[PDB]
Each structure stands twice: as structure tokens, then as C-alpha cells.
Amino acid sequence: QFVNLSPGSTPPVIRLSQGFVSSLVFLDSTGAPWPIAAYDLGDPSSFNIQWD
Amino acid sequence: EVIDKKAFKDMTRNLYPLNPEQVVKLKQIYETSEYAKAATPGTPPKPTATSQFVNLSPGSTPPVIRLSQGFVSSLVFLDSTGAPWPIAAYDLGDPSSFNIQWDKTSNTLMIQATKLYNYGNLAVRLRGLNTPVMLTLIPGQKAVDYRVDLRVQGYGPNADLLLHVLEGVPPPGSRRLVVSGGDARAWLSNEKMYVRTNLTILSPGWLASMTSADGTHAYEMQKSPVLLVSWHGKVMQLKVEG
Amino acid sequence: QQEIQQRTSDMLTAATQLVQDWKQVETQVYTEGT
Amino acid sequence: QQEIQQRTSDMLTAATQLVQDWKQVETQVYTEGT
Amino acid sequence: QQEIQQRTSDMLTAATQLVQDWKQVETQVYTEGT
Amino acid sequence: QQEIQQRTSDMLTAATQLVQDWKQVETQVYTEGT
Amino acid sequence: RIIYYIQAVIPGRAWLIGSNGSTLTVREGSKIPGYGMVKLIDSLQGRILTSSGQVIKFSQEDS
Amino acid sequence: RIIYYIQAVIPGRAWLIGSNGSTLTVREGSKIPGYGMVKLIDSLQGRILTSSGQVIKFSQEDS
Amino acid sequence: RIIYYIQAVIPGRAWLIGSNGSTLTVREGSKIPGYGMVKLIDSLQGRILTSSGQVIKFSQEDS
Numbered sequence: 168q169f170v171n172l173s174p175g176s177t178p179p180v181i182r183l184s185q186g187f188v189s190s191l192v193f194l195d196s197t198g199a200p201w202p203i204a205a206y207d208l209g210d211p212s213s214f215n216i217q218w219d
Numbered sequence: 220e221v222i223d224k225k226a227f228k229d230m231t232r233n234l235y236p237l238n239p240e241q242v243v244k245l246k247q248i249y250e251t252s253e254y255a256k257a258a259t260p261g262t263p264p265k266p267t268a269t270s271q272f273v274n275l276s277p278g279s280t281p282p283v284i285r286l287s288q289g290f291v292s293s294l295v296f297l298d299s300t301g302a303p304w305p306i307a308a309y310d311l312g313d314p315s316s317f318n319i320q321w322d323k324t325s326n327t328l329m330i331q332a333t334k335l336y337n338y339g340n341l342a343v344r345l346r347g348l349n350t351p352v353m354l355t356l357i358p359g360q361k362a363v364d365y366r367v368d369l370r371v372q373g374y375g376p377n378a379d380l381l382l383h384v385l386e387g388v389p390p391p392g393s394r395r396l397v398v399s400g401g402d403a404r405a406w407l408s409n410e411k412m413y414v415r416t417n418l419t420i421l422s423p424g425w426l427a428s429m430t431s432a433d434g435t436h437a438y439e440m441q442k443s444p445v446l447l448v449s450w451h452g453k454v455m456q457l458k459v460e461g
Numbered sequence: 462q463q464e465i466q467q468r469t470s471d472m473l474t475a476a477t478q479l480v481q482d483w484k485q486v487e488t489q490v491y492t493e494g495t
Numbered sequence: 496q497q498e499i500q501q502r503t504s505d506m507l508t509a510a511t512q513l514v515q516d517w518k519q520v521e522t523q524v525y526t527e528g529t
Numbered sequence: 530q531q532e533i534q535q536r537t538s539d540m541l542t543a544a545t546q547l548v549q550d551w552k553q554v555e556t557q558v559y560t561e562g563t
Numbered sequence: 564q565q566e567i568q569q570r571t572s573d574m575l576t577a578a579t580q581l582v583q584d585w586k587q588v589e590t591q592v593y594t595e596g597t
Numbered sequence: 598r599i600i601y602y603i604q605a606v607i608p609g610r611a612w613l614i615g616s617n618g619s620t621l622t623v624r625e626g627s628k629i630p631g632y633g634m635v636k637l638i639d640s641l642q643g644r645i646l647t648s649s650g651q652v653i654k655f656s657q658e659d660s
Numbered sequence: 661r662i663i664y665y666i667q668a669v670i671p672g673r674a675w676l677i678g679s680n681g682s683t684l685t686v687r688e689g690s691k692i693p694g695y696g697m698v699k700l701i702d703s704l705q706g707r708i709l710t711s712s713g714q715v716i717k718f719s720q721e722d723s
Numbered sequence: 724r725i726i727y728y729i730q731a732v733i734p735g736r737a738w739l740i741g742s743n744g745s746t747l748t749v750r751e752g753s754k755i756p757g758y759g760m761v762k763l764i765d766s767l768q769g770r771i772l773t774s775s776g777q778v779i780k781f782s783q784e785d786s
Binding site: 233236237242245246249 | 543
């Protein structure tokens with residue numbers, strides 16, 4: 168998908184299901200890898216994240 | 220000898236008193252109950268993002284923030300020029316209804332509402348700003364503001380639209396322009412035509428031009444309803460309206 | 462008439478639970494950042 | 496005439512379970528690191 | 530027709546046994562090798 | 564008649580023995596050598 | 598004229614933004630230019646009416 | 661013209677995507693260009709009913 | 724044409740690999756090239772019933 172920064176646009180939506188591993192690898196429009204400085208998670212009981 | 224068959228059948232029935240399709244239906248029943256519990260009565264709010272300006276005028280009404288319980292909003296502070304301004308300190312009344320993780324070097328606030336429908340306010344003091352900024356935070360609105368950007372009247376320690384167009388974002392305030400014959404994105408806001416393509420304009424001559432590393436071009440010119448574009452050794456002509 | 466007092470008590474116990482909720486005014490925290 | 500109140504009690508137990516399931520709120524977590 | 534309820538008993542114990550098995554799923558694990 | 568139950572109960576004992584024999588799975592071992 | 602859209606609606610008070618972007622907060626006893634006073638505010642569903650009879654509501658884009 | 665397919669479905673709101681990729685979310689009362697407005701949102705069965713006599717389904721390739 | 728074979732069979736949905744080798748998840752509501760529409764899916768013994776009267780099963784070489 169495309170990631171937008173205008174305020175009027177909509178944030179992306181990701182489908183999940185219980186008992187599965189969804190892999191999210193974060194790139195740009197040019198396809199280069201981009202490291203993640205930090206992240207914030209809501210309901211860590213219901214959502215588990217592993218991140219080197 | 221049929222006593223053995225009777226006892227085997229009784230042992231089977233008492234060992235496994237559940238039919239497999241009854242087991243399947245009970246699993247579906249449990250999923251139905253999970254849908255009942257996880258269903259949200261009323262109306263889910265619309266996920267949105269917003270950007271406002273906060274004024275130092277005493278007569279100005281203070282800004283307010285739509286919030287949701289269990290969802291974290293990201294507050295980003297910029298100056299008048301849009302440069303980021305690092306945060307010196309902050310104060311939060313009613314710490315039960317709200318929690319906030321904030322990296323001390325950063326300028327972005329991750330604010331999560333904990334209670335249901337209790338509103339409060341936040342006091343923010345920046346690095347270069349003497350004036351405290353107070354924001355009224357109200358939970359449970361029909362539009363959940365995932366990301367709020369706030370301009371300020373001052374300037375931080377750090378001191379355009381064509382490049383945003385070259386990215387692909389439409390410029391602010393412009394009106395939609397519909398073209399004919401080609402595939403180009405055009406806008407007009409201050410009677411100056413702005414065009415974004417991957418092709419090359421030929422006829423009127425660009426007043427200012429820019430391009431990216433992939434091959435996308437953006438130009439600004441004056442008003443012209445007729446354009447001429449040549450590519451791959453062949454020349455074609457396109458038109459717009461208004 | 463004999464139903465009032467049982468309807469009194471659960472009204473009484475819940476409202477005393479409710480009226481003690483509007484007593485707590487928790488203190489704020491001034492957090493410094495550097 | 497007694498079935499109504501015992502099912503009422505069972506639904507009250509289920510309701511208490513549901514309200515203690517809906518009262519709590521998980522907090523956010525934050526993670527950094529170079 | 531009191532012969533029903535004893536079969537209702539052990540089925541309830543069996544189904545409630547399965548409903549906590551289906552309730553929980555243990556989380557993933559992550560490993561490494563350099 | 565009365566001959567069914569003791570013909571049923573012993574079959575229940577062997578069946579309850581036999582299920583956990585079918586249940587468990589012995590974990591493999593990987594032996595790395597040099 | 599400038600169209601007012603609701604920003605924040607609570608019992609008692611209300612918050613409006615103009616179509617130009619005029620931020621404001623009102624209550625039941627209030628003065629709205631171009632629309633008169635306020636006669637009734639429903640905090641549920643954002644059903645806010647002016648004394649002259651125009652209805653101020655949220656945007657259709659933001660519902 | 662412009663074609664819409666379901667991106668995500670919840671009770672209450674609905675998420676769709678465009679033929680050009682335009683992703684969006686709608687209310688129960690939401691006047692959608694090219695399709696009129698939504699008569700009713702059904703969370704089950706994957707049906708998005710419009711007042712233009714058209715029901716949005718998912719992408720059949722991506723189901 | 725391309726003859727399909729089963730490589731993964733569960734209740735609910737199935738999987739088809741052809742002579743080209745394209746592995747496809749197939750539902751009850753799903754079209755299929757060379758077979759029309761999947762009329763029914765039998766998870767037992769690997770039987771895929773189509774609207775064209777054709778049953779996709781496993782290979783005789785690899786059942």
C-alpha cells in the first residue's frame with residue numbers, strides 16, 4: 168500500500184486473525200529499507216510484537 | 220454374545236457423549252459469543268487525522284482534542300514555519316484517565332485515554348517558548364483523531380508545495396482541474412497552473428520545473444488551456460477546462 | 462408497601478457506592494524532560 | 496416461578512463477569528533502542 | 530422422563546473442558562542465529 | 564440386564580487407559596557431532 | 598455565509614468551527630452571528646439547533 | 661468508470677478501496693459518489709448495499 | 724489444457740496445483756479456468772466438484 172501524510176487522507180488498515188503471524192516489513196516508495204526508531208502498541212495483551 | 224456389543228456401545232456413548240457435529244456447532248457457538256462480546260454497540264468512530272494552529276491571543280478559544288479509550292493519539296508540535304519544536308516539560312491533570320509515554324529528546328506525545336467519558340487538559344511548555352499551552356482533551360467523539368499536528372505562533376530552534384506535488388500529494392487550497400487527451404494532474408489556486416506528469420511539456424515553456432529520481436516531473440506555468448507534449452519521437456496535444 | 466424497604470436498600474447501597482466516587486480528586490504530576 | 500429467579504441469578508453472575516471483563520483497560524507500551 | 534439430565538451433566542463438563550481449550554492460544558516464540 | 568454394567572465398566576477402564584497412549588507425542592532429539 | 602460545523606459536543610457546552618475555520622464554543626445561552634441564539638442543545642447525536650431554525654451539524658465528510 | 665471493492669468490514673463502519681486504489685471508510689448514512697448512498701450496512705455476508713442498486717463485494721482474487 | 728491436482732486439503736477451502744504449477748486456494752464461491760465454477764468441495768478423499776461435471780482429485784502418481 169501507499170502511506171500518506173496529508174491530514175485529510177486515511178490511515179492504512181491491516182487484516183489479522185487469531186493464531187497467526189503477520190509479517191510487516193517497512194519500506195518507502197523507492198523500495199529502500201527504513202529502520203524503525205520506536206513504536207507504540209495498544210492492547211499488548213491482545214497483540215504481541217517481536218522486533219529486533 | 221450380544222451383551223458384549225451392548226456394553227461396548229454403552230462404553231462408547233458414556234466415554235464420548237458429544238457428537239462431532241455438535242462439537243462443531245458448539246465451537247461456532249463460542250465464536251458467536253466472542254462476536255457478541257467483541258461487538259461494539261452504537262457507532263464506531265471514523266479514523267481521521269488533523270492539523271490546527273494554536274494562537275497566543277488571550278481572546279482566542281483554546282484548542283480541543285477528540286480522543287478514544289484504548290487508542291493512542293500522536294501529538295506533533297510545529298512552529299509557524301512547520302519546523303519541529305522540542306518539548307521542555309508537560310503536566311497532566313487527572314493521571315488515572317490518561318497515560319503518556321514520551322521520550323525526553325522527542326517532541327511527539329503518545330496520549331492514550333484510559334477512562335470512558337472524562338475530559339481534562341494538558342499543559343505543555345516548550346524549549347524556547349515562555350508561554351504555557353493548554354489543550355482541552357475530550358474522549359469519545361464520533362471522529363477519532365489518530366494524529367494531530369499543531370502549529371504555533373512562535374519559532375523553534377530550527378529555521379515546498381512543488382516538492383509535495385512531485386511526491387504526489389495535492390497542494391492545499393487548490394481546486395481540481397480536469398484534463399482532456401492525456402494523463403496529468405493539474406491544479407490552480409492563485410491563477411497559476413501547476414502540472415504533474417511523467418511526460419515533458421513542450422509548447423508554453425516552464426516558469427519553474429522540478430523532477431525526482433524516478434522520472435516524475437512537476438512544472439508551474441501560467442494559464443494555458445492547450446498543451447503540447449512530445450515523447451518517444453511523437454508529438455501529441457492535450458487540453459484542459461478552466 | 463413491603464416491597465419498598467428491599468427496594469430502599471439496594472438503592473441505598475449502590476448510591477453510597479456512587480456518592481463516594483465523586484470524592485476523589487487525584488493530584489497531578491509535573492514531569493520534567495531533558 | 497422459581498426458574499425465573501434462578502435464571503435471573505445465573506444471568507446476574509454472567510453480567511458481573513461481563514462488567515469485570517469490560518471495566519479494565521490495557522495500557523500502551525513503548526519500546527526504543529538503537 | 531428424568532433420564533435426560535444425567536447425560537446433560539457430563540456433556541456440560543466435557544463442553545466446558547473444551548471451551549477453555551479453545552479460549553486460550555499460547556503465544557508465538559522468536560529465535561535467532563547469527 | 565445387570566450383566567451389562569460390569570461388562571461396561573472394565574471396558575471403560577481400558578479405554579481411559581488407551582486415550583492418553585494415543586494422546587502423547589515423544590519429542591525428537593537432534594544430535595550434532597564433531 | 599460561513600457554515601458552522603460542530604467540533605466538540607458535551608452536555609452543557611458545544612464547540613463549533615466555521616467553514617472558513619472560525620473556532621468557537623457556545624452553550625444554551627449563546628449568540629450565533631447570522632443564525633440567532635441557541636434554543637436547544639442535544640448532547641446525544643449532535644442535534645444542535647439555532648433560534649432562527651438552521652441546524653448546525655457535523656460535516657458529511659467527517660461523520 | 662470507478663470501481664469499489666471491500667478492504668475491511670466491521671459492524672458500524674465500512675472500509676473500501678478504489679479501482680485507482682482510493683481507500684475510504686463510510687458510515688451507515690454516507691452519501692458515496694458514483695453509488696448514491698448506503699441503504700444498510702451488513703457486517704456478515706460481505707454485502708455493501710447502495711442506493712444505486714449496486715452491492716460492493718470484496719476482490720474475488722483477494723478473498 | 725492444464726490438469727489440476729490437490730496439494731492441500733482442509734475443511735472450508737482447498738488447494739489446486741496445475742500442470743503449470745500454479746497453487747491456488749479455492750473456495751465454494753470461486754471460479755476456475757477449464758472447470759467453470761466449483762460446485763462443491765469434498766475434503767474427504769480429495770474431491771473437488773465443478774459446475775462442468777469435473778472432479779479435481781489428487782494425482783495417481785502422488786495421491
